[PDB]
Amino acid sequence: STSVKPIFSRDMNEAKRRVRELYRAWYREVPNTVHLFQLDISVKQGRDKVREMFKKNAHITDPRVVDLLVIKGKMELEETIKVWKQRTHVMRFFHETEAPRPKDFLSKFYVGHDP
Amino acid sequence: DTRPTVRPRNDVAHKQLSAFGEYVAEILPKYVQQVQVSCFNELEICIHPDGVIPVLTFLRDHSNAQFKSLADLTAVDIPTRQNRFEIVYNLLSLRFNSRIRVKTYTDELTPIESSVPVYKAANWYEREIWDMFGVFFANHPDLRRILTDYGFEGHPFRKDFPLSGYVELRYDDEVKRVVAEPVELAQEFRKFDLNSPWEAFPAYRQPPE
Amino acid sequence: SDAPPLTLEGIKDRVLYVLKLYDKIDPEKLSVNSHFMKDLGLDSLDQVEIIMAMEDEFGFEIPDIDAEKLMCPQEIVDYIADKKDVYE
Amino acid sequence: RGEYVVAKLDDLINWARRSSLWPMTFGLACCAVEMMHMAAPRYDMDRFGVVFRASPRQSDVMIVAGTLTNKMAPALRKVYDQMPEPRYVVSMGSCANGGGYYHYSYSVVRGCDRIVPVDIYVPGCPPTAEALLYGILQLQKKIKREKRLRIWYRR
Amino acid sequence: MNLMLALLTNFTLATLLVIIAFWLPQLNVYSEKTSPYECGFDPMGSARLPFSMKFFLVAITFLLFDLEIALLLPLPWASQTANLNTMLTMALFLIILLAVSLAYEWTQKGLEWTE
Numbered sequence: 251s252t253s254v255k256p257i258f259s260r261d262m263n264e265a266k267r268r269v270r271e272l273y274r275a276w277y278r279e280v281p282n283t284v285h286l287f288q289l290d291i292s293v294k295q296g297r298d299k300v301r302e303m304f305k306k307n308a309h310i311t312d313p314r315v316v317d318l319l320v321i322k323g324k325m326e327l328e329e330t331i332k333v334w335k336q337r338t339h340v341m342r343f344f345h346e347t348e349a350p351r352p353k354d355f356l357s358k359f360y361v362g363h364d365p
Numbered sequence: 366d367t368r369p370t371v372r373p374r375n376d377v378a379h380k381q382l383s384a385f386g387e388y389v390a391e392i393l394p395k396y397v398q399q400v401q402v403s404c405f406n407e408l409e410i411c412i413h414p415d416g417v418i419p420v421l422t423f424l425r426d427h428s429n430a431q432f433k434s435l436a437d438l439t440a441v442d443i444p445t446r447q448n449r450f451e452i453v454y455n456l457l458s459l460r461f462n463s464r465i466r467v468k469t470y471t472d473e474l475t476p477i478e479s480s481v482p483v484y485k486a487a488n489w490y491e492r493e494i495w496d497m498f499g500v501f502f503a504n505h506p507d508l509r510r511i512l513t514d515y516g517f518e519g520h521p522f523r524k525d526f527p528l529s530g531y532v533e534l535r536y537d538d539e540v541k542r543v544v545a546e547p548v549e550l551a552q553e554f555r556k557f558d559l560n561s562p563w564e565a566f567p568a569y570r571q572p573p574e
Numbered sequence: 575s576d577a578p579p580l581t582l583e584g585i586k587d588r589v590l591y592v593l594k595l596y597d598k599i600d601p602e603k604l605s606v607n608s609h610f611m612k613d614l615g616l617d618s619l620d621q622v623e624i625i626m627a628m629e630d631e632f633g634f635e636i637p638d639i640d641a642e643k644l645m646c647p648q649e650i651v652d653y654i655a656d657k658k659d660v661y662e
Numbered sequence: 663r664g665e666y667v668v669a670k671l672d673d674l675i676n677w678a679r680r681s682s683l684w685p686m687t688f689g690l691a692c693c694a695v696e697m698m699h700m701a702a703p704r705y706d707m708d709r710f711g712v713v714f715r716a717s718p719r720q721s722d723v724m725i726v727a728g729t730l731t732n733k734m735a736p737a738l739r740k741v742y743d744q745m746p747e748p749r750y751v752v753s754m755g756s757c758a759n760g761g762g763y764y765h766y767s768y769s770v771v772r773g774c775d776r777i778v779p780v781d782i783y784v785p786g787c788p789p790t791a792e793a794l795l796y797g798i799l800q801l802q803k804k805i806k807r808e809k810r811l812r813i814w815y816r817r
Numbered sequence: 818m819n820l821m822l823a824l825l826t827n828f829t830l831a832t833l834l835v836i837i838a839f840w841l842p843q844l845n846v847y848s849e850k851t852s853p854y855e856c857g858f859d860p861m862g863s864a865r866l867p868f869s870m871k872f873f874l875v876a877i878t879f880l881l882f883d884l885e886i887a888l889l890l891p892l893p894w895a896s897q898t899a900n901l902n903t904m905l906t907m908a909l910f911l912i913i914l915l916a917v918s919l920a921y922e923w924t925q926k927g928l929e930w931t932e
């Protein structure tokens with residue numbers, strides 16, 4: 251009970267090192283991604299998007315969940331560096347065609363029934 | 366076995382497989398948890414996840430096993446189990462013209478050792494299991510999605526993944542590219558409740574709760 | 575040969591120069607001893623970006639075990655000087 | 663008269679385009695097998711002037727013969743875009759029409775018409791080689807009724 | 818005069834056909850239409866990258882043998898001389914040495930493409 255087999259990191263301190271290593275790889279890659287794919291975004295927008303993705307999981311405290319997130323993040327990086335992804339796949343992080351949905355109670359009330 | 370519509374039994378093979386099942390459980394007691402033979406003569410060895418490399422190596426190399434072919438490797442998702450995933454190895458022996466099934470278990474976070482060292486065929490079967498179920502295989506030469514689209518989020522073959530998914534693609538003329546948007550169906554898939562409220566097979570009746 | 579060598583005054587100037595190009599740091603709030611987290615208000619990932627800028631400026635690789643301790647501009651100067659043998 | 667001349671020129675270019683249709687060598691799934699049988703000796707699509715060519719830059723028609731998945735959809739749009747105009751698309755089979763047997767799959771595009779414009783829809787699973795050939799001859803009649811020059815003449 | 822006029826007509830007809838090709842048709846040019854072709858997915862790198870030549874040694878040898886045709890083509894005129902004994906000797910000597918060159922490269926694995 252509570253004794254589990256690890257993936258890569260035996261504790262959060264070790265896991266956070268892999269998070270920082272992954273962040274440095276993504277940070278150095280955005281200039282190349284915005285160049286090869288000929289994206290109409292800036293290097294600042296891309297690096298802001300990377301930061302947005304990392305802060306989205308800043309509340310994790312289980313090292314194994316962090317290990318999978320780094321594993322999944324490295325697969326994403328490998329797909330982008332080798333240009334397995336297309337321009338359509340790299341722009342799906344920006345949701346350019348999705349109309350902004352309401353956030354406040356009143357706006358959600360007027361348009362439909364969803365919470 | 367004179368009944369035209371009923372499948373005849375082969376009790377010679379049933380004894381042979383039962384005998385060999387004990388043989389494996391005697392040689393690998395550290396890993397073997399349960400052995401069984403079905404009414405259609407298929408032997409199953411249920412092992413601890415730690416025994417993936419020892420058990421398969423014995424079954425491939427032992428002179429009385431010689432299971433040189435990995436017929437297939439797949440996972441089954443059973444949400445009600447503490448370990449929801451069930452890794453299934455189907456091996457074939459050309460020397461002895463026999464088949465054996467090796468089964469283990471894991472969950473969302475526990476790795477399972479990669480069997481590429483034992484069977485080169487497991488390279489893509491483990492990529493498919495990871496891609497479609499999210500089961501991580503440790504020490505895999507290169508693990509990544511094999512079937513799903515690039516950037517696809519989630520694991521389709523999990524029982525809690527919806528049939529139509531969460532996103533769908535179209536072409537948008539404003540951005541001049543194919544985009545991904547939340548799924549809306551013109552006709553919703555119609556769920557049919559087909560189960561009959563009367564028990565079909567008394568032989569499999571589980572003890573009352 | 576003839577190119578001027580590295581001096582602690584030179585390292586300090588370049589380090590403080592990189593930190594001024596960083597957008598999240600107020601130029602008239604940067605002290606050579608100010609803590610990145612406590613004083614400037616930056617977060618973990620901001621510190622990582624700074625270290626990568628230092629690698630670009632000084633052209634050498636700073637591992638994560640070492641970069642995790644450089645929490646102020648002065649500590650960067652010591653680390654760069656220590657690893658570049660600049661005792662001047 | 664100028665209307666008479668543009669009418670005859672329109673009949674000439676319309677004739678040339680429907681008599682020299684060059685489908686792109688592009689097949690996705692089982693429906694491409696039935697497209698092979700339309701090139702086989704019994705039906706001999708080549709005798710109508712319909713010749714496959716592999717390069718999208720030398721093709722006049724795209725036949726979307728099979729299932730279109732989300733992974734392949736960007737590729738389809740690219741090869742469609744790289745076709746010099748005029749270019750027509752023929753959708754062959756239930757999968758390419760509206761998803762068919764796999765309408766409710768997480769990985770299938772519910773109709774190729776979400777990705778490209780479609781001129782003729784050929785039903786079936788698969789349409790017989792003779793049913794695809796009906797769609798090709800129905801496409802030719804569609805080209806025969808174009809009024810490109812007449813519409814230009816009175817702009 | 819005749820040869821030059823024949824060449825001008827052939828390349829004038831070729832040019833006029835190209836001009837008609839670009840000015841007669843209706844054009845609809847946009848970015849995706851003119852992107853390079855790589856079977857549907859974006860090319861992974863530049864087509865101007867180095868392309869290894871595995872038959873480089875045979876290509877150099879072509880330069881040396883292509884100069885034997887210059888030395889061998891005068892043979893029909895050479896056979897008209899009164900010094901047939903000398904002419905036939907040097908004709909066969911020149912061809913034989915051309916053959917010994919082929920034999921040397923063949924035996925030394927020179928005609929085999931590099932792995």
Ligand SMILES: COC1=C(OC)C(=O)C(C/C=C(\C)CC/C=C(/C)CC/C=C(/C)CC/C=C(/C)CC/C=C(/C)CC/C=C(/C)CC/C=C(/C)CC/C=C(/C)CC/C=C(\C)CCC=C(C)C)=C(C)C1=O
Pocket residue numbers: 687688689690691692694695697698701708713714728
């Ligand atoms: C079973 O598993 C699967 C596969 O596995 C096989 C698959 O593959 C696929 C994928 C499938 C596909 C991509 C489509 C497959 C469909 C087929 C039909 C392929 C099957 C086999 C064939 C043999 C079909 C056709 C191929 C050939 C090689 C037939 C040869 C005959 C021909 C007519 C081809 C071209 C030949 C000639 C001689 C030239 C004709 C070409 C022209 C362009 C016409 C003339 C050219 C001109 C330029 C015009 C002439 C005049 C000019 C230029 C002007 C001159 C005059 C002046 C006045 C100027 C799937 C899904 C699959 O499931």
Ligand SMILES: CCCCCCCCCCCC(=O)OC[C@H](COP(=O)(O)OCC[N+](C)(C)C)OC(=O)CCCCCCCCCCC
Pocket residue numbers: 663664667668671814815816817
């Ligand atoms: C090398 C130099 C090239 C010069 C340009 C050549 C291309 C353009 C010529 C158009 C002239 C014009 O005016 O034709 C047009 C006129 C009518 O004019 P409209 O209705 O007032 O047009 C005003 C503008 N609309 C139309 C948009 C409203 O239609 C005709 O009667 C004939 C038109 C068809 C062309 C006839 C030629 C047939 C050749 C057959 C070859 C096999």
Ligand code: SF4
Pocket residue numbers: 691692693727728729754755756757758762763786787788789
């Ligand atoms: S429409 Fe039918 S034959 Fe065609 S690809 Fe789909 S399932 Fe196969």
